[PDB]
Design a protein around this nucleic acid. Structure first.
Lengths: 102, 138, 144, 55, 67, 143, 101, 72
RNA sequence: ACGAGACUCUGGCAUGCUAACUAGUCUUAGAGGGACAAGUGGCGUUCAGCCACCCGAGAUUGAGCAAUAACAGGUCUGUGAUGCCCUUAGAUGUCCGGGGCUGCACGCGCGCUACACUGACUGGCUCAGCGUGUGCCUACCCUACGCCGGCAGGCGCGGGUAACCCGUUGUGAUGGGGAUCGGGGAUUGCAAUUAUUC
């Protein structure tokens, strides 16, 4: 039913929506801030993907758009290289919060 | 004078009597893509389109397929076709062509020749399961 | 040159055989076809309107695998669980009065009958009849 | 007189009809395969019967 | 861990000093000769001893070892 | 697949007063004797299919099932599809209606209360008549 | 019929297999065709019993196993040959049931 | 909290909503059900009627997502 | 020198082997083979060894057994295993017999239980159990068709000392998972309610 290439959105939402850092625990006590580290992009991208799975659930779980009809969104989550996401911009807000210690 | 290897996977099996004849392919004893579970229809179509008709133009195969479980009887069918084809090519024509075709088929994927070794382990001591334990009271 | 009747996917196979049997036109269902729960794991009553033909054909498939299959082991694809309130489960089956009523409706059809030793047996002439009918309807107007 | 009382109603689950064939113990009976012992007596003689710890 | 206990170590050492002539490097040959010349009462222990003797020959082929 | 019926915002079956929010034909809980396998058996005996459009379904089917429920004994249909069977004061299955009245008759406690029995006061306090254990489990029934 | 069956049952594989091999050798010395041994699935007599005689301690159980192996061999021979090959000073434990059917 | 949508079949209103679906980029029953906020079964009946007109062809059946297409 | 390892049992593997008229070498069970940190890289007085990767069915693979001194831990209510201080005839023998504890303002401890196109029926394609099963006792064993309301089944009816028989055992309270509780023939257990039964 497409005829054209989904490549554009396919790539350009998620696979560079992705964040560029996360946060880790500090010292021996204290749960009021988290020190900014990164990962080789695979683990960070897959944690973002897991939170995006949670987001697709919450967009289906108690919502309108159901499971097995978001193939556009899955192809978006899959392919390669630009930025349009939602759970990933939550991840980027946390990015900035943790990076406020760099 | 008995060159037969059938195909078994997990708990399911399929005896593949392969012999020379008119050379036509009969699979599952039922239409090609009509199978009731409908879960894994597209996975069966890899060899019939990857290999061609000339490769299997002399094979008469009759299969006794039994087993409950899609992962069991399915993927057993592919192990069976690969192994029977490999044995037939090794025996009837040569070994270099066999190396080429078998390399192609088992280079498509690995799980053909290897079955999962995971099996349910024994229920263990003083607990509902093999590792869980009855709640300890203080 | 010689055809077995389990040649096509059994969905459409039983559909065609039951179509022939129901187009025979001399058989009408009694008033106790569906009101039976049969097995608890079901939620509703039979709907096919040809469940007699397919039940007799499936019993026949079991017969082919096992001689005297009155007790031939049943196969239930859907589940290994049956939670039934306040007690554990059982193993699927149907009713016996339904079996005898269907056998009373089966006399004169030369399809399936009991045996002197306990169980059922096959009717070879009706067997070859359905074989020939299936072969000459499959090789005539479905693949030509 | 004696027959006026005995065998009035059948005891089809008489617990007292069984005892440990070695020490006559009422509890912990092992009737499986016909041992008919208290489990302690079975443990005492299990190796001699032929039962062994393999697993 | 794969630490080889004193039994396999001592057996491999005595095996290599007594019949160094027959023993080689390829595990199949070490296993065969080890079965032939050593009365090892297990098969797993036999494979362990053969593996350690293979390692010890990899050691000796590139210098002397004090054992 | 086009029907000349009009969308009705007022529809009444059995003189109840309930909100119309979800779909129909299996939210018939307000209707006490129609539904599930008995209604399915009747409908399949009526030779009607599911070719038309859903959502806009009228009450002719439920009326026909009720009417066939009015006189079920003539056709020798298995009479195990009715609520209260083999009850005192009538050996035949008499019909009743109206809301706020089935619930009372689901527990005919008058005679057992009269005979000075423990089962009457077992039923009355809302507690366990067969004896469901309630001291660590089974605290529901009042929440 | 000349069909005779031998059922050799014992709790160990070694004595049972030695007896089976000796019997097959004796039958094969005679120019007689004999069906190969058939091995039953060796039904296992599990018994689990609480370790502690009292009811004190951690709940510990002895899992006792009794493994019974059974083999059948078919042949065609008169009774004298069977009862001459049976009395061969059998090693203990290998119970023999010889049937004609 | 279901919405109120005009489902009445009239002389005038009926033949204004049966010619709005093909005026969108991504036209599928799931997309119309998430966007235009009407039951997807109505879109299923619509494309079934389009099939009845003889301009498309059926391939497969499913209680959620049906397959009717064209190859001309 | 014990203990640990090794060792026994246990699953995992053959275009191999010893053979079965219940499967057609798939099931059963073998005198046996197979893994060993073995091959190659990288860390290691370049030792013992650790990580990784092809290859391989399998690359820290279930359990069992398990060192003296121990503890006033439990058991004399398992034991003509056990030394005698010592009550009562209401012997802590018997006899389908007889209150409880199946109370609910809870004093505590094991227990019975999954949130939606995944949960559940259209019954529209061949499923697994690991195992149990009838006389020294002993009278109690596991089970297949008919009276038919809708099947276990109130009575006959055969098989099984068992690989032979059982048995190839539309956007969220709606339709969706049950808060007490009532009818149909009840499996035949004196009593079940002062625990057996769709």
């Amino acid at each position: 039913l497409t005829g054209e290439n989904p490549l554009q959105v396919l790539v350009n939402a998620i696979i560079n929506s992705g964040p560029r850092e996360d946060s880790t625990r500090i010292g021996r006590a204290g749960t009021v801030r988290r020190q900014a580290v990164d990962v080789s992009p695979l683990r960070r991208v897959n944690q973002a993907i897991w939170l995006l799975c949670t987001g697709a659930r919450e967009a289906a779980f108690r919502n309108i758009k159901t499971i097995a009809e978001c193939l556009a969104d899955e192809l978006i989550n899959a392919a390669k290289g630009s930025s349009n996401s939602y759970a990933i911009k939550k991840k980027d807000e946390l990015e900035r919060v943790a990076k406020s210690n760099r | 004078q008995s060159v037969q290897v059938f195909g078994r996977k997990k708990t399911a099996t399929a005896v593949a009597h392969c012999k020379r004849g008119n050379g036509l392919i009969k699979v599952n004893g039922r239409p090609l893509e009509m199978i009731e579970p409908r879960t894994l229809q597209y996975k069966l179509l890899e060899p019939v389109l990857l290999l061609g008709k000339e490769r299997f133009a002399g094979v008469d195969i009759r299969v006794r397929v039994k087993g409950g479980g899609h992962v069991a009887q399915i993927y057993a069918i592919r192990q069976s076709i690969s192994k029977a084809l490999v044995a037939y090519y090794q025996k009837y024509v040569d070994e270099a062509s066999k190396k080429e075709i078998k390399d192609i088929l088992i280079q498509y994927d690995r799980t053909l020749l290897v079955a999962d070794p995971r099996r349910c382990e024994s229920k263990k001591f003083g607990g509902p399961g093999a590792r869980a334990r009855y709640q300890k009271s203080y | 040159p010689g055809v077995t009747v389990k040649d096509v996917n059994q969905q459409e196979f039983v559909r065609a055989l039951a179509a022939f049997l129901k187009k025979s036109g001399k058989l009408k269902v009694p008033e106790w076809v569906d009101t039976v729960k049969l097995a608890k794991h079901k939620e509703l009553a039979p709907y096919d309107e040809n469940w007699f033909y397919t039940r007799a054909a499936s019993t026949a498939r079991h017969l082919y695998l096992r001689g005297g299959a009155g007790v031939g082991s049943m196969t239930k694809i859907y589940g290994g669980r049956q939670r039934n309130g306040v007690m554990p489960s059982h193993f699927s089956r149907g009713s016996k009065s339904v079996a005898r009523r269907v056998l009373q409706a089966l006399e004169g059809l030369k399809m399936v009958e009991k045996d002197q030793d306990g169980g059922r047996k096959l009717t070879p002439q009706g067997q070859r009849d359905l074989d020939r009918i299936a072969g000459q309807v499959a090789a005539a107007n479905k693949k030509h | 007189g004696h027959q006026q009382l005995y065998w009035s109603h059948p005891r089809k689950f008489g617990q007292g009809s069984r005892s440990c064939r070695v020490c006559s113990n009422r509890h912990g009976l092992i009737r499986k395969y016909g041992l008919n012992m208290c489990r302690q007596c079975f443990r005492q003689y299990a190796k001699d019967i032929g039962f062994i710890k393999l697993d | 861990g794969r630490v080889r206990t004193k039994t396999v170590k001592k057996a491999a050492r005595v095996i290599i000093e007594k019949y160094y002539t027959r023993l080689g490097n390829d595990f199949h040959t070490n296993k065969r000769v080890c079965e032939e010349i050593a009365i090892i009462p297990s098969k797993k222990l036999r494979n362990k001893i053969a593996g350690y003797v293979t390692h010890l020959m990899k050691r000796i082929q590139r210098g002397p070892v004090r054992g | 697949l086009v029907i000349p019926e009009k969308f009705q915002h007022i529809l009444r079956v059995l003189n109840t007063n309930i909100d119309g929010r979800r779909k129909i034909a299996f939210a018939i809980t307000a209707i006490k004797g129609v539904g599930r396998r008995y209604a399915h058996v009747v409908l399949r005996k009526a030779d009607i299919d599911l070719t038309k459009r859903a959502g806009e379904l009228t009450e002719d089917e439920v009326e026909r099932v009720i009417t066939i429920m009015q006189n079920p004994r003539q056709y020798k249909i298995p009479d195990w599809f009715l609520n209260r069977q083999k009850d005192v004061k009538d050996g035949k299955y008499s019909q009743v209606l109206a809301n706020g009245l089935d619930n009372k008759l689901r527990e005919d406690l008058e005679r057992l209360k009269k005979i000075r029995a423990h089962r009457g006061l077992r039923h009355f306090w809302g507690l366990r008549v067969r004896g469901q254990h309630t001291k660590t489990t089974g605290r529901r029934g009042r929440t | 019929i000349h069909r005779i069956r031998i059922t050799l049952t014992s709790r160990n594989v070694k004595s049972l297999e030695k007896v089976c091999a000796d019997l097959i050798r004796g039958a094969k010395e005679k120019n007689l065709k004999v069906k190969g041994p058939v091995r039953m699935p060796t039904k296992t007599l599990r018994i689990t019993t609480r370790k502690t005689p009292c009811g004190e301690g951690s709940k510990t159980w002895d899992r006792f196993q009794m493994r019974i192996h059974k083999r059948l061999i078919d042949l065609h021979s008169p009774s004298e040959i069977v009862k001459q090959i049976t009395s061969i000073s059998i090693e203990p434990g290998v119970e023999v049931e010889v049937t004609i059917a | 909290d279901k919405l109120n949508n005009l489902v009445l079949f009239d002389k005038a209103t009926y033949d204004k909503l049966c010619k709005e679906v093909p005026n969108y980029k991504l036209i599928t029953p799931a997309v119309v059900s998430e966007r235009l906020k009407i039951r997807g079964s109505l879109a299923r009946a619509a494309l079934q009627e389009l099939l009845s007109k003889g301009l498309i062809k059926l391939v497969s059946k499913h209680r959620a997502q049906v397959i009717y297409t064209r190859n001309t």
